[PDB]
Amino acid sequence: GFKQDIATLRGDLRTYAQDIFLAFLNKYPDEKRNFKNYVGKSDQELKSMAKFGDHTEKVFNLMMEVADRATDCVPLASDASTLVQMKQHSGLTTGNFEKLFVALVEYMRASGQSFDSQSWDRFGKNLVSALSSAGMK
Amino acid sequence: GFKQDIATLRGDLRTYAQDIFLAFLNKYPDEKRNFKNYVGKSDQELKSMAKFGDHTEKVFNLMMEVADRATDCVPLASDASTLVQMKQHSGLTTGNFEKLFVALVEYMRASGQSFDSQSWDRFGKNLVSALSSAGMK
Numbered sequence: 001g002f003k004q005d006i007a008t009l010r011g012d013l014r015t016y017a018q019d020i021f022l023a024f025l026n027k028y029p030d031e032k033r034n035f036k037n038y039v040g041k042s043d044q045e046l047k048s049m050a051k052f053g054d055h056t057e058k059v060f061n062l063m064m065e066v067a068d069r070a071t072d073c074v075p076l077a078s079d080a081s082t083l084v085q086m087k088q089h090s091g092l093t094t095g096n097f098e099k100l101f102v103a104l105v106e107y108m109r110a111s112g113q114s115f116d117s118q119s120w121d122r123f124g125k126n127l128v129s130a131l132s133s134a135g136m137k
Numbered sequence: 138g139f140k141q142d143i144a145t146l147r148g149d150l151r152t153y154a155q156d157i158f159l160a161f162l163n164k165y166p167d168e169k170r171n172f173k174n175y176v177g178k179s180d181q182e183l184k185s186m187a188k189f190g191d192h193t194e195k196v197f198n199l200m201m202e203v204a205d206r207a208t209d210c211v212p213l214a215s216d217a218s219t220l221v222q223m224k225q226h227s228g229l230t231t232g233n234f235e236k237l238f239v240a241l242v243e244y245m246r247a248s249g250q251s252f253d254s255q256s257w258d259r260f261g262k263n264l265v266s267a268l269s270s271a272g273m274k
């Protein structure tokens with residue numbers, strides 16, 4: 001279930017973070033404009049940039065911290081408030097996060113792994129709600 | 138589901154609140170140490186004691202608001218803080234709440250009605266977790 005999938009993801013977090021994030025940027029190419037250094041590059045070009053793997057891992061590490069601290073796939077309001085207040089999240093609206101989770105869910109479903117994709121879909125919905133309640137537009 | 142059950146209970150709340158609270162006090166008779174005016178009384182005696190009806194209705198009035206404000210059966214932290222800090226809940230520990238929800242779920246399962254008993258089980262558990270988070274021992 002959800003707890004085990006956090007351990008699956010953590011065990012090879014570099015690899016999953018890159019593959020899920022690429023699945024997001026490819027499913028929603030307009031989302032690339034939040035990442036100007038990534039524009040005009042294919043997947044394998046991106047994986048050659050040191051900050052791409054380092055950034056993407058750090059994003060999914062904080063995702064996994066928020067997921068492990070959630071109760072019944074409802075994240076803490078304090079964690080949602082950390083993500084709203086991050087400087088690097090200044091432009092963003094909740095739909096950015098909505099689409100990342102749609103991509104993540106789609107990825108888990110297409111993988112051969114026994115991920116609890118229903119729980120990650122609830123988690124994504126409940127994180128979007130919590131980001132709104134913590135003051136994201 | 139859970140949202141419908143909140144409307145079911147609200148539709149006949151003083152009856153459900155007294156039957157549920159009686160089921161709790163009768164399943165865990167030691168719990169009357171918190172309600173000493175209830176000692177030595179049959180169900181029908183308690184149902185003719187004004188503060189039994191009035192206070193038990195007010196307990197359920199607030200319980201249904203906490204449930205209605207929850208997301209996926211996880212209550213708001215502000216509601217859990219309210220319940221920890223209430224003067225009338227001084228010295229209570231989370232075990233008191235755990236047993237209340239055990240009794241409430243068993244009452245739902247035994248009823249002729251159609252409740253989502255599993256959602257109430259989760260809600261009890263998640264409420265106890267939130268009470269502990271908000272500093273109840």
Ligand code: HEM
Nearest residue numbers: 031034035054055058059060062063088089092096097100
């Ligand atoms: C739960 C989901 C998310 C988490 C846990 C998260 C976490 C993080 C973290 C930890 C960083 C710092 C990375 C570093 O400096 O190495 C970061 C940077 C950033 N994040 Fe997020 N983020 C999430 C969702 C998103 C989404 C959906 C977008 C836009 C579609 C976004 C846009 C950015 C941008 C533009 C930066 C700075 C640029 C960069 O690091 O390349 N984030 N995020």
Ligand code: HEM
Nearest residue numbers: 168171172191192195196197199200225226229233234237
């Ligand atoms: C989610 C569950 C609970 C909610 C929403 C809640 C709510 C309330 C409210 C609104 C009152 C005020 C009643 C009034 O003064 O008219 C009350 C009083 C009180 N509650 Fe709770 N309560 C809950 C669980 C419990 C539990 C589990 C116990 C102990 C087993 C308990 C013990 C008390 C006591 C001792 C009083 C004051 C004495 C009395 O009303 O007779 N409560 N509670």
